[PDB]
């Protein structure tokens, strides 16, 4: 997801 990227 881009949540922690």
Same mark, same amino acid.
């Given at each position: 997801? &881009? &949540?922690?990227?």
């Amino acid at each position: 997801y &881009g &949540g922690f990227m």
